[PDB]
Amino acid sequence: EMQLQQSGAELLRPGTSVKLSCKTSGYIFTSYWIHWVKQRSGQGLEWIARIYPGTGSTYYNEKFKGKATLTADKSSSTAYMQLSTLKSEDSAVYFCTRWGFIPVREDYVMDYWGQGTLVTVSSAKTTAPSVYPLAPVCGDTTGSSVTLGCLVKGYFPEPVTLTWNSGSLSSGVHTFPAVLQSDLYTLSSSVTVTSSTWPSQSITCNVAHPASSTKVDKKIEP
Amino acid sequence: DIVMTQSPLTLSVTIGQPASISCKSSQSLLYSNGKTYLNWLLQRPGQSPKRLIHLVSKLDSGVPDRITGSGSGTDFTLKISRVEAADLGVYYCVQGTHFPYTFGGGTKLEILRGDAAPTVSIFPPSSEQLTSGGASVVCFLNNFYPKDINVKWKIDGSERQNGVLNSWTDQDSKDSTYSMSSTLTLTKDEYERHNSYTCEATHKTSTSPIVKSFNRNEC
Ligand SMILES: O=C(O)CNC(=O)CCCP(=O)(O)OCc1ccc([N+](=O)[O-])cc1
Ligand SMILES: [Zn+2]
Ligand SMILES: [Zn+2]
Ligand SMILES: [Zn+2]
Ligand SMILES: [Zn+2]
Ligand SMILES: [Zn+2]
Ligand SMILES: [Zn+2]
Ligand SMILES: [Zn+2]
């Protein structure tokens, strides 16, 4: 089982640099090209560069010469990409991929991708979120089924992790994309259950904000 | 660099019907070895991209043959013979004939389903929040279709445009519906100066606005 694991989200100050890692396993690292791709604001992909770990040979998209530097540690089967002097345009999600094109065969083997690494270039300060339980009064949806919510507001930077009943309750869950306003994000999630479950059995909102090492559970009491 | 143009930008198709996406290049993609390096990728919601086709029409392993690719020169087409729920996502064509490699802008494929009226839930500020001096009123408009909806907040009969924060989810791969959240944030003091808080929606499924509200008082 071929796998590529990328490092976590990064918050970088303007003008500084970062080194992203792409740890691979399940195949002979030195025998295939590893490519790096950039994605900005949703649909919008760009090819950055490729490296052949076996020789260390690299090819860069002109646009990125001086911006990105690719390396690869054969002893650990890890490819790295250093981004230098970060600015606005560098905020994006970066993916590494064992693309699979075999130049000699002029054919392809399966492409395997890493999960992506989100880089945020900002000088805004890290802020812990405030989690607020949303019990219904009118958001009851009468009997039959009732819907509860969880409001996570005023945090920076992304991401935040929100689960219900520690992940036990996954169906009928809606987690909305965080929205930035005045240097802080707001995110919310709703969960719909039957009148029979709540308030009879407890529903708890679990939130984690790695950047500030915040972990909080809010029980939706009536 | 080669410019890759994809059309349409978005396509809505019912499960079971065919779909086709076009990709035009600014230069012929015929390489000097006679091979044409044009690939098609699919990026499903919340997932990394995945290659579907290479060399214009060769399917990657594990890719359903419902998907077909064709074209040459500067014109290429990806066709899905019978759309299934799992086809939801953004499709991209990417060329490797000319360096540097360039991608098209993507085509979002959305599943066309029967119209669904929103299930709206409204929530007054939590005690915890009021304690901090803030007050947010939240309204969830769950599982509706089409995505096009307009929500307005009204306090004591007048529209409130300032302090509103809206968020939408992508199309759900379980029922093909959309959901949206709307939060109105005020100071605790102003919150305690008004009576009725209304979350009002305009959607295809109704000739009149869809409403949900509450009156804050005491007891
Ligand atoms: O490099 C050149 O100049 C000549 N062309 C070639 O060698 C063929 C490259 C074919 P291919 O690998 O399909 O290149 C396109 C290509 C490569 C990587 C990628 N990616 O998303 O990771 C997307 C697209
Ligand atoms: Zn051949
Ligand atoms: Zn092949
Ligand atoms: Zn060329
Ligand atoms: Zn040439
Ligand atoms: Zn008034
Ligand atoms: Zn008045
Ligand atoms: Zn008023």
Coordinates of C-alpha atoms and ligand atoms in Angstrom, one line a residue:
Chain A
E1 CA 0.0 0.0 0.0
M2 CA 1.6 3.1 -1.4
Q3 CA 1.2 6.2 0.9
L4 CA 2.4 9.8 1.0
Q5 CA 1.9 11.7 4.2
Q6 CA 2.4 15.5 4.3
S7 CA 3.1 17.8 7.2
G8 CA 0.5 19.9 9.0
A9 CA -0.9 23.3 8.2
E10 CA 1.5 26.2 8.5
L11 CA 1.0 29.8 9.6
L12 CA 4.0 31.8 8.2
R13 CA 5.0 35.4 8.7
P14 CA 5.5 37.5 5.6
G15 CA 9.1 37.4 4.4
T16 CA 10.0 34.2 6.1
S17 CA 10.4 30.7 4.7
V18 CA 9.0 27.2 5.3
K19 CA 10.0 23.6 4.6
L20 CA 7.1 21.3 3.8
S21 CA 7.6 17.5 4.1
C22 CA 6.2 14.6 2.1
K23 CA 6.8 11.2 3.7
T24 CA 6.3 8.2 1.5
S25 CA 6.0 4.5 2.0
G26 CA 4.9 1.4 0.1
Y27 CA 7.2 1.7 -2.9
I28 CA 10.8 2.2 -4.0
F29 CA 11.3 6.0 -3.2
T30 CA 14.3 6.4 -5.5
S31 CA 12.7 5.0 -8.6
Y32 CA 9.9 7.5 -9.3
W33 CA 9.6 11.2 -9.8
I34 CA 7.8 13.2 -7.1
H35 CA 6.0 16.3 -8.3
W36 CA 4.7 19.3 -6.3
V37 CA 1.5 21.1 -7.2
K38 CA -0.1 24.3 -5.9
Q39 CA -3.8 25.0 -5.4
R40 CA -5.2 28.5 -4.7
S41 CA -8.7 29.5 -3.6
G42 CA -10.4 26.2 -4.7
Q43 CA -10.2 25.4 -8.4
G44 CA -6.9 26.7 -9.6
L45 CA -3.9 24.3 -10.0
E46 CA -0.3 25.0 -10.9
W47 CA 2.6 22.7 -11.4
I48 CA 5.7 23.7 -9.4
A49 CA 8.5 21.2 -9.9
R50 CA 9.6 17.5 -9.9
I51 CA 12.5 15.7 -8.4
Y52 CA 13.9 12.2 -9.0
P53 CA 15.1 11.1 -5.5
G54 CA 17.5 8.5 -7.0
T55 CA 19.8 11.2 -8.4
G56 CA 18.4 14.4 -6.9
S57 CA 17.7 15.7 -10.4
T58 CA 15.1 18.5 -10.4
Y59 CA 13.1 20.5 -13.0
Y60 CA 11.4 23.8 -12.1
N61 CA 8.5 25.8 -13.6
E62 CA 10.3 29.1 -14.4
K63 CA 7.7 31.0 -12.2
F64 CA 9.0 29.2 -9.1
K65 CA 12.8 29.3 -9.6
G66 CA 14.1 31.0 -6.4
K67 CA 10.7 30.5 -4.7
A68 CA 10.8 26.7 -4.3
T69 CA 13.7 24.4 -3.6
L70 CA 13.1 20.6 -3.7
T71 CA 15.2 18.0 -1.8
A72 CA 14.8 14.4 -0.9
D73 CA 16.1 12.3 2.0
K74 CA 16.6 8.8 0.7
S75 CA 17.4 7.5 4.1
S76 CA 13.9 8.4 5.2
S77 CA 12.0 8.3 1.9
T78 CA 10.9 11.9 2.5
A79 CA 10.7 14.6 -0.2
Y80 CA 10.8 18.3 1.0
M81 CA 10.0 21.6 -0.6
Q82 CA 11.3 24.8 0.9
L83 CA 9.4 28.0 0.1
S84 CA 11.3 31.2 0.6
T85 CA 10.4 34.8 1.4
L86 CA 6.7 34.2 1.6
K87 CA 4.2 36.7 0.5
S88 CA 0.5 36.9 -0.4
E89 CA 0.4 34.7 -3.5
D90 CA 2.1 31.9 -1.5
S91 CA -0.9 31.2 0.7
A92 CA -2.3 28.0 -0.8
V93 CA -2.5 24.2 -0.4
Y94 CA 0.5 22.3 -1.7
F95 CA 0.3 18.7 -2.8
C96 CA 3.1 16.2 -3.4
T97 CA 2.4 13.3 -5.8
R98 CA 4.2 10.2 -7.1
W99 CA 2.6 11.1 -10.4
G100 CA 3.5 7.9 -12.2
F101 CA 4.7 8.9 -15.6
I102 CA 7.6 6.6 -16.5
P103 CA 9.6 8.4 -19.2
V104 CA 11.3 5.3 -20.5
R105 CA 8.1 3.4 -21.0
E106 CA 6.3 6.5 -22.2
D107 CA 3.4 5.3 -20.1
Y108 CA 2.0 5.6 -16.6
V109 CA 1.7 3.8 -13.4
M110 CA -0.9 4.9 -10.8
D111 CA -0.7 8.3 -9.3
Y112 CA -0.7 8.6 -5.4
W113 CA -1.1 11.9 -3.7
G114 CA -0.4 13.4 -0.3
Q115 CA -3.3 15.0 1.6
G116 CA -2.1 18.5 1.0
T117 CA -0.5 21.1 3.3
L118 CA -2.2 24.5 3.8
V119 CA 0.1 27.4 4.2
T120 CA -1.2 30.7 5.6
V121 CA 1.0 33.8 5.2
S122 CA -0.1 36.3 7.8
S123 CA 1.2 38.5 10.6
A124 CA -2.2 38.2 12.5
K125 CA -2.0 36.7 16.0
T126 CA -3.0 33.2 17.0
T127 CA -6.3 33.3 18.9
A128 CA -8.1 30.5 20.7
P129 CA -11.7 29.9 19.8
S130 CA -14.8 30.3 22.0
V131 CA -17.2 27.4 21.6
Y132 CA -21.0 28.1 22.2
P133 CA -23.7 25.5 22.4
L134 CA -26.8 26.1 20.4
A135 CA -29.8 24.5 22.0
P136 CA -33.2 24.9 20.2
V137 CA -36.0 27.2 21.2
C138 CA -37.3 27.6 17.7
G139 CA -34.5 25.6 16.1
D140 CA -36.3 22.6 17.5
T141 CA -38.0 21.5 14.3
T142 CA -41.0 20.5 16.5
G143 CA -41.0 16.8 17.6
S144 CA -39.8 13.9 15.4
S145 CA -36.3 15.3 14.9
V146 CA -34.6 18.1 16.7
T147 CA -31.4 19.9 15.5
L148 CA -28.7 21.2 17.7
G149 CA -25.6 23.3 16.8
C150 CA -22.2 24.4 17.9
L151 CA -20.7 27.9 17.3
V152 CA -16.9 28.2 17.2
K153 CA -16.0 31.8 16.9
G154 CA -13.1 34.2 17.1
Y155 CA -10.1 32.0 16.4
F156 CA -7.0 32.2 14.2
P157 CA -5.6 30.6 12.2
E158 CA -7.3 27.6 10.6
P159 CA -7.8 24.7 11.1
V160 CA -10.1 23.8 14.0
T161 CA -11.4 20.2 14.5
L162 CA -15.1 19.7 15.4
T163 CA -16.7 16.3 16.1
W164 CA -19.9 15.2 17.8
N165 CA -19.9 12.7 20.7
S166 CA -16.1 12.2 19.9
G167 CA -16.9 11.1 16.4
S168 CA -19.5 8.6 17.5
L169 CA -22.2 10.8 16.0
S170 CA -21.3 11.3 12.3
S171 CA -24.6 11.1 10.4
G172 CA -26.9 14.1 10.0
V173 CA -23.9 16.3 10.8
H174 CA -23.3 19.5 8.8
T175 CA -20.0 21.4 9.4
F176 CA -19.8 24.7 7.6
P177 CA -16.6 26.1 6.1
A178 CA -15.0 28.7 8.3
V179 CA -15.4 32.3 7.3
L180 CA -12.8 35.0 8.0
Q181 CA -13.9 38.4 9.3
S182 CA -11.7 41.0 11.0
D183 CA -8.7 38.7 11.4
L184 CA -10.8 36.0 13.1
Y185 CA -12.7 32.9 11.8
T186 CA -16.1 31.7 12.7
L187 CA -17.3 28.1 12.0
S188 CA -20.5 26.3 12.9
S189 CA -21.9 22.8 12.8
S190 CA -25.5 21.4 13.1
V191 CA -26.6 17.9 14.1
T192 CA -30.0 16.5 13.6
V193 CA -31.4 13.8 15.9
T194 CA -34.8 12.3 16.8
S195 CA -36.9 13.8 19.6
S196 CA -36.2 10.4 21.3
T197 CA -32.5 10.9 21.5
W198 CA -32.2 14.5 22.8
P199 CA -32.4 15.5 25.6
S200 CA -32.7 12.0 26.9
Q201 CA -29.1 11.2 25.9
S202 CA -26.3 13.7 25.8
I203 CA -24.9 15.3 22.7
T204 CA -21.5 16.9 23.0
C205 CA -19.6 19.2 20.7
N206 CA -15.8 18.5 20.6
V207 CA -13.5 21.2 19.3
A208 CA -9.7 21.3 18.9
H209 CA -7.5 24.2 17.7
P210 CA -4.0 22.8 17.4
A211 CA -2.4 26.2 16.8
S212 CA -3.3 27.3 20.3
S213 CA -3.5 23.8 21.7
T214 CA -7.1 24.3 22.7
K215 CA -9.4 21.3 23.3
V216 CA -12.9 21.9 24.5
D217 CA -16.1 19.9 24.8
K218 CA -19.5 21.6 25.1
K219 CA -22.5 19.6 26.2
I220 CA -25.7 20.8 24.6
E221 CA -27.9 21.2 27.7
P222 CA -31.5 22.2 27.2
Chain B
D1 CA 2.9 29.0 -21.6
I2 CA 0.0 27.0 -23.0
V3 CA -3.4 28.3 -22.0
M4 CA -5.9 25.5 -21.3
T5 CA -9.6 26.6 -21.6
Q6 CA -12.3 24.3 -20.2
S7 CA -16.0 24.7 -20.8
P8 CA -18.5 24.7 -19.3
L9 CA -17.6 26.1 -15.9
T10 CA -20.3 24.0 -14.2
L11 CA -22.7 21.4 -15.4
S12 CA -25.7 20.0 -13.6
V13 CA -26.6 16.5 -14.7
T14 CA -29.2 14.0 -13.4
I15 CA -27.9 10.6 -12.3
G16 CA -28.1 8.3 -15.3
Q17 CA -27.5 10.9 -18.0
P18 CA -24.4 11.6 -20.1
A19 CA -22.0 14.5 -19.5
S20 CA -19.2 15.9 -21.6
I21 CA -16.5 18.5 -20.8
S22 CA -14.4 20.4 -23.3
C23 CA -10.8 21.4 -23.1
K24 CA -9.1 23.7 -25.7
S25 CA -5.3 24.4 -25.8
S26 CA -3.5 27.4 -27.2
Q27 CA -0.9 25.2 -28.9
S28 CA -1.3 21.7 -30.4
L29 CA -0.5 19.1 -27.8
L30 CA 1.1 16.8 -30.3
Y31 CA 4.6 16.1 -28.9
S32 CA 7.6 15.6 -31.3
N33 CA 7.4 11.9 -30.6
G34 CA 3.9 11.7 -32.0
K35 CA 2.3 11.2 -28.5
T36 CA -0.3 13.6 -27.1
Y37 CA 0.2 14.2 -23.4
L38 CA -3.2 15.3 -22.2
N39 CA -4.5 14.1 -18.9
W40 CA -7.9 14.5 -17.1
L41 CA -8.1 14.6 -13.3
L42 CA -11.0 14.6 -10.8
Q43 CA -10.8 16.3 -7.5
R44 CA -13.7 15.1 -5.3
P45 CA -14.9 17.4 -2.5
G46 CA -12.3 17.4 0.3
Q47 CA -9.9 15.1 -1.5
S48 CA -6.7 15.4 -3.5
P49 CA -6.9 15.3 -7.3
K50 CA -6.8 11.9 -9.0
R51 CA -5.9 11.1 -12.6
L52 CA -8.7 9.5 -14.6
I53 CA -7.2 9.5 -18.1
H54 CA -3.7 9.9 -19.7
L55 CA -2.6 10.0 -23.3
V56 CA -5.9 11.5 -24.4
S57 CA -8.0 8.3 -24.1
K58 CA -6.2 5.8 -22.0
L59 CA -8.0 5.0 -18.7
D60 CA -5.9 4.7 -15.5
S61 CA -6.4 1.5 -13.6
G62 CA -9.4 1.3 -11.4
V63 CA -11.2 4.0 -13.4
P64 CA -14.7 3.0 -14.6
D65 CA -15.0 2.8 -18.4
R66 CA -18.2 4.9 -18.2
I67 CA -15.5 7.6 -18.5
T68 CA -14.2 8.2 -22.0
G69 CA -11.6 10.6 -23.5
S70 CA -11.0 11.8 -27.0
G71 CA -9.7 14.6 -29.1
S72 CA -6.4 15.7 -30.7
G73 CA -4.5 18.8 -31.6
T74 CA -6.0 21.6 -29.5
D75 CA -9.5 20.1 -28.8
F76 CA -10.2 17.4 -26.3
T77 CA -13.4 16.1 -24.6
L78 CA -14.0 14.0 -21.5
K79 CA -17.4 12.2 -21.6
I80 CA -19.2 10.3 -18.9
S81 CA -21.7 7.9 -20.5
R82 CA -23.9 7.5 -17.4
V83 CA -23.5 9.9 -14.4
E84 CA -23.4 8.4 -10.9
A85 CA -23.3 10.2 -7.5
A86 CA -19.6 9.5 -7.1
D87 CA -18.8 11.6 -10.2
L88 CA -19.4 14.8 -8.2
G89 CA -16.3 17.1 -8.1
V90 CA -14.2 19.3 -10.2
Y91 CA -12.6 18.0 -13.5
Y92 CA -9.4 19.4 -14.9
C93 CA -7.5 18.8 -18.1
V94 CA -3.7 19.1 -17.8
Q95 CA -1.1 19.1 -20.6
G96 CA 2.4 17.7 -20.4
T97 CA 3.5 18.3 -24.0
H98 CA 4.9 21.8 -23.4
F99 CA 6.9 22.9 -20.5
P100 CA 5.9 24.1 -18.0
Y101 CA 2.9 21.8 -17.5
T102 CA -0.4 23.8 -17.3
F103 CA -3.9 23.0 -16.1
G104 CA -7.4 24.1 -17.3
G105 CA -9.6 26.1 -14.9
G106 CA -11.8 23.2 -13.9
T107 CA -15.4 22.2 -14.5
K108 CA -17.6 21.6 -11.6
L109 CA -20.0 18.7 -12.1
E110 CA -23.1 19.0 -9.9
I111 CA -25.9 16.4 -9.6
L112 CA -29.2 17.7 -10.7
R113 CA -32.0 16.4 -8.3
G114 CA -35.6 17.1 -7.4
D115 CA -36.1 20.5 -5.7
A116 CA -35.9 20.3 -1.9
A117 CA -37.3 22.9 0.5
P118 CA -34.9 24.0 3.3
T119 CA -35.4 22.8 6.9
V120 CA -34.7 26.0 8.9
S121 CA -33.6 26.1 12.6
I122 CA -33.0 29.3 14.5
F123 CA -31.0 29.7 17.7
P124 CA -30.8 32.6 20.1
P125 CA -27.5 33.5 21.9
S126 CA -26.1 31.1 24.5
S127 CA -25.8 32.3 28.1
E128 CA -22.1 31.7 27.8
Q129 CA -21.9 34.2 25.0
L130 CA -24.1 36.8 26.5
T131 CA -21.8 36.7 29.6
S132 CA -18.9 37.8 27.3
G133 CA -20.9 40.8 26.1
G134 CA -21.7 39.4 22.6
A135 CA -24.8 37.8 21.1
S136 CA -25.0 35.8 17.9
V137 CA -28.3 34.5 16.5
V138 CA -27.8 31.5 14.2
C139 CA -30.0 30.1 11.5
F140 CA -29.4 26.8 9.7
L141 CA -31.0 26.2 6.3
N142 CA -30.4 22.5 5.8
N143 CA -30.8 20.2 2.8
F144 CA -32.3 22.3 0.0
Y145 CA -32.0 22.2 -3.8
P146 CA -31.2 24.2 -6.0
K147 CA -28.3 25.9 -4.2
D148 CA -29.6 29.4 -5.1
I149 CA -31.1 30.9 -1.9
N150 CA -31.3 34.4 -0.4
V151 CA -31.5 34.9 3.3
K152 CA -32.2 38.2 5.1
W153 CA -32.3 38.9 8.8
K154 CA -35.0 41.1 10.2
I155 CA -35.1 42.6 13.7
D156 CA -38.4 44.0 14.8
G157 CA -39.5 44.2 11.2
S158 CA -36.5 46.0 9.7
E159 CA -33.8 44.4 7.7
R160 CA -30.4 44.1 9.3
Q161 CA -27.5 43.8 6.8
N162 CA -24.5 44.6 9.1
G163 CA -23.0 41.8 11.2
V164 CA -24.1 38.9 9.0
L165 CA -21.8 36.0 8.3
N166 CA -22.9 33.3 5.8
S167 CA -21.4 29.9 5.0
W168 CA -22.5 27.2 2.5
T169 CA -21.5 23.6 2.3
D170 CA -20.6 21.9 -1.1
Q171 CA -23.1 19.5 -2.6
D172 CA -23.7 16.5 -0.3
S173 CA -22.7 13.2 -1.8
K174 CA -25.5 11.4 0.1
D175 CA -28.6 13.3 -1.0
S176 CA -27.2 15.9 -3.4
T177 CA -28.5 18.7 -1.3
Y178 CA -26.9 21.9 0.0
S179 CA -27.0 23.5 3.5
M180 CA -26.1 27.0 4.6
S181 CA -25.5 28.7 7.9
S182 CA -26.2 32.4 8.7
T183 CA -25.0 34.1 11.8
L184 CA -26.0 37.6 12.9
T185 CA -23.8 39.0 15.7
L186 CA -24.7 42.0 17.8
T187 CA -23.6 43.4 21.2
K188 CA -25.3 42.0 24.2
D189 CA -26.8 45.4 24.9
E190 CA -28.4 45.9 21.5
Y191 CA -29.6 42.3 21.5
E192 CA -31.5 43.0 24.7
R193 CA -33.1 46.1 23.2
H194 CA -35.1 44.2 20.5
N195 CA -37.9 41.7 20.5
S196 CA -38.3 39.7 17.3
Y197 CA -35.4 38.1 15.4
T198 CA -36.4 36.7 12.0
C199 CA -34.4 34.6 9.6
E200 CA -36.1 34.9 6.2
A201 CA -35.3 32.9 3.0
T202 CA -36.2 33.2 -0.6
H203 CA -36.0 29.8 -2.5
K204 CA -37.5 28.3 -5.7
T205 CA -39.6 25.9 -3.6
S206 CA -41.9 28.7 -2.4
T207 CA -43.8 31.7 -3.8
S208 CA -43.5 33.5 -0.4
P209 CA -40.4 33.9 1.8
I210 CA -39.6 31.0 4.1
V211 CA -39.6 32.2 7.7
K212 CA -38.3 31.2 11.2
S213 CA -38.2 33.5 14.2
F214 CA -38.3 34.0 17.9
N215 CA -39.3 36.8 20.3
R216 CA -36.9 37.2 23.2
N217 CA -38.5 38.3 26.4
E218 CA -38.4 37.1 30.1
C219 CA -39.7 34.0 32.0
Ligands
LIG1 O1 8.9 17.6 -19.9 C1 8.7 17.9 -21.1 O2 9.0 19.0 -21.5 C2 8.2 16.8 -22.2 N1 7.1 16.1 -21.8 C3 7.2 15.0 -21.1 O3 8.2 14.4 -20.8 C4 5.9 14.3 -20.9 C5 5.2 14.6 -19.5 C6 3.9 13.9 -19.6 P1 3.0 14.1 -18.1 O4 3.7 13.5 -17.0 O5 1.6 13.7 -18.3 O6 3.1 15.7 -17.8 C7 2.0 16.5 -17.3 C8 1.8 16.6 -15.9 C9 2.8 16.1 -15.0 C10 2.5 16.1 -13.6 C11 1.3 16.6 -13.2 N2 0.8 16.6 -11.8 O7 -0.3 17.0 -11.6 O8 1.5 16.2 -10.8 C12 0.4 17.1 -14.1 C13 0.6 17.1 -15.4
ZN2 ZN 2.4 2.4 -28.8
ZN3 ZN -1.2 3.7 -20.0
ZN4 ZN 6.5 23.6 -26.5
ZN5 ZN 8.8 22.5 -28.8
ZN6 ZN -36.7 49.1 15.8
ZN7 ZN -39.1 50.5 17.7
ZN8 ZN -36.0 46.7 17.8

